[PDB]
Amino acid sequence: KPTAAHALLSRLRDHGVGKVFGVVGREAASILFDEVEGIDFVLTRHEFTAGVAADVLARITGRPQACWATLGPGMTNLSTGIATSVLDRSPVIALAAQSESHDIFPNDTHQCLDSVAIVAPMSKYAVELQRPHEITDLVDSAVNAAMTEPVGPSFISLPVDLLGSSEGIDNPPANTPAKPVGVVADGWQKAADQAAALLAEAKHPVLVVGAAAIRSGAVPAIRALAERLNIPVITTYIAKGVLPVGHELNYGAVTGYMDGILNFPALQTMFAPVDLVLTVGYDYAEDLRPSMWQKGIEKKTVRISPTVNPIPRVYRPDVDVVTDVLAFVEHFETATASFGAKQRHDIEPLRARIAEFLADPETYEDGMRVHQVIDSMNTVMEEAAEPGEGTIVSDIGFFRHYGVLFARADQPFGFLTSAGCSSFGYGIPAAIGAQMARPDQPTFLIAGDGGFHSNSSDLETIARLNLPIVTVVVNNDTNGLIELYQNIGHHRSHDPAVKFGGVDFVALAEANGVDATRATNREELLAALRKGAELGRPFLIEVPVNYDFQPGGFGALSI
């Protein structure tokens, strides 16, 4: 007789789920993961990897995805993946086993924690299964909550006895939302008209585009609007690629680190003459903060979001348009149909400074510089990928902000990083998710030694799934970002809190069954990248780097 395990997997399948990422515990006595045709288990080395892979697969597909952990520490390990989903915004169904229903005594029963209480504050929905047959409605409610803006994870705790029970089990339509449900304020049309009047008066407007605009399906619409009215497009970290590489209105992504990295007044060049900022699909969690565009002259602001403003302390837009992003753009197109195109502000000196970093021909004594590494990756990505295809993934660290500034993105989600949660070790699972979402496209990963090693064991998973991911590890034997913060705050370093000894990442990758090589200059790196891209197997490249940063140029980070 089919049990709740079968009913659970069946309902996931009904919602389009074909993979469950995770680590299985003793609940394997209740669930094999062969119960339902068309749904396969994906075993990782750590639960964090499972949660993040599901998050990234969910982002790219735009469909709910699923991850799995055992009770107690299984669930707490998964919780960092849950945190990624809640802050980065992805519809994930997170599932964890629990002690037998009659034996649930949190902090007393072996391996028993109060899972729902722990996960509730970091999720859209959290529940414990109580009556086996109800799992079908619990999955539906989890999906419902996961697919409402801000999209996020829903959690179901599964007592082992109930998971293996057929009591009451003997499906209605799933009706999975094709795109996220959102909120809409009465009179948003009048607000959008107010925004249009502001646009009429503005000499130098900009569109600041966040990921929610991509979820709404508004990329083509935003592009046509921008092109018609000659409005520059600036993006958050993961909204890179909403305009093609080389497009005249592609003014790039912003990071608070950019002035410090470029030794150039980048933020002032970008924003100083701007008089109207339209934050299209705005989300504070993406870390493009109002302080970043508040440069030079005073600006009017328009917020467009399928959510009520959660942060009026920080952002009080002149016009708040609470509605679906695509709905807004379509109404805005009509309202601005007869408007003359604007003159856009000059950012050529910034474009020149960026092109200079990328072309940097210098050979340094102490390893490569990260801008040279990314320039090399861009070159090979452009060669390996079809037009409008390919993914560059970045883990977290100082180098990540080089990825934000310099990495090629020729499609929405063509550059992937964690903007909301920013857990180190993000790189491997995100590359797994990306490669699975785009099986015939090249997937490159860049990670630093600190973050990469925090989660490097899942190299084995990459080898086992034979995902042809090309990974570049930039190694300076340091949590480099953190050494920068030490210097910002104290004007000196303290090595015991930031410094490592040597890790041979080439030998590490090969130990996991991943072919690898060391590259120490542009010539060796291009060769290694070209080899990896054509290998038909995963490949890893270790690059020695150094940063030589100055803490004085990073005032934009202050909160």
Ligand X SMILES: Cc1ncc(C[n+]2csc(CCOP(=O)(O)OP(=O)(O)O)c2C)c(N)n1
Kindly list the residues in this chain that would bind ligand X in the complex (CB under 6 A). Answer: 23, 25, 70, 73-74, 77, 396-399, 422-424, 448-451, 476, 478-482
Cis peptide before 244 (omega within 30 of 0): no
Catalytic-role residue among 402, 426, 547, 549: 547
**C-alpha neighbours within 13 Å on the C-beta side of residue 33:** 19
Position 519, amino acid: A
Q: Which does 296 bind (CB under 5 to 8 A by kind): ligand X, Mg ion, a second copy, none?
A: none
**C-alpha neighbours within 13 Å on the C-beta side of residue 154:** 23
Nearest-angstrom CA–CA distance, 318 and 332: 17
360 is a catalytic site residue: no
Least distance to ligand X, CB of residue 207, Å: 30
The answer to whether 155 is a known ligand-binding residue is no
> With binding defined as CB under 8 A, does residue 95 bind a second copy?
no
The answer to whether 401 is a known ligand-binding residue is yes
Catalytic-role residue among 27, 449, 483, 542: 449
Catalytic-role residue among 77, 391, 455, 478: 478
The answer to whether 478 is a known ligand-binding residue is yes
Q: Which does 511 bind (CB under 5 to 8 A by kind): a second copy, ligand X, Mg ion, none?
A: a second copy
The answer to whether 400 is a known ligand-binding residue is yes
Least distance to a second copy, CB of residue 442, Å: 23
Instruction: Tell me if 449 sits within 8 A of 516, measured CB to CB.
Output: no
Which helix H or strand E contains 88, and what residues bound it? helix 73-88
The answer to whether 451 is a known ligand-binding residue is yes
Of 387-446, binders to a second copy (CB under 8 A) are 419-425
How does DSSP assign 153-180, residue by residue?
A: -EEEEEEHHHHT--TT---------SS-
478 is a catalytic site residue: yes
Nearest-angstrom CA–CA distance, 242 and 63: 20
Indicate which single residue of 187, 220, 552, 555 sits in contact with a second copy (rule: CB under 8 A): 187
542 is a catalytic site residue: no
Closer CB to a second copy, residue 57 or residue 322? 322
424 is a catalytic site residue: yes
**Window 253-292: contact mask with a second copy (x via CB under 8 A):** -------------------------------xxxx-----
Specify burial of residue 275 (Cβ count, 10 A radius: 0-12, 13-18, 19+): middle
Q: Which does 398 bind (CB under 5 to 8 A by kind): a second copy, ligand X, Mg ion, none?
A: ligand X
What SS3 string covers 234-278?
Answer: EECCCCCCCCCCCCCCEEEECCCCHHHHHCCCHHHHHHCCCCEEE
Nearest-angstrom CA–CA distance, 55 and 73: 20
What SS3 string covers 424-474?
Answer: CCCHHHHHHHHHHHCCCCCEEEEEEHHHHHHCHHHHHHHHHCCCCCEEEEE
Of 9-48, binders to a second copy (CB under 8 A) are 23-30, 32-34, 40-43, 45-46, 48
The answer to whether 525 is a known ligand-binding residue is no
Give the binding range for a second copy (CB under 8 A) out of 197-205, 242-250, 271-279, 486-494.
Answer: 486-494
Sign of CA dihedral 538, 539, 540, 543: negative
> With binding defined as CB under 5 A, does residue 414 bind Mg ion?
no
**Helical pair 135-146 and 4-14, crossing angle rounded to 10 deg:** 30
500 is a catalytic site residue: no
> With binding defined as CB under 8 A, does residue 341 bind a second copy?
no
Catalytic-role residue among 415, 424, 426, 539: 424
Edge-to-edge strands, sheet with 205-209: 250-253, 233-235, 205-209, 276-280, 300-305, 319-322
Q: Which of 291, 273, 279, 297 is nearest to 235 (CA)?
A: 279
Of 503-532, binders to a second copy (CB under 8 A) are 503-505, 507-508, 510-513
The answer to whether 557 is a known ligand-binding residue is yes
Q: Which residues are annotated as a binding site?
A: 257, 287, 396-401, 422-424, 449-451, 476-481, 547, 557
Q: Which residues are annotated as a binding site for substrate?
A: 257, 287, 400-401, 557
Catalytic residue IDs: 47, 424, 449, 476, 478, 547
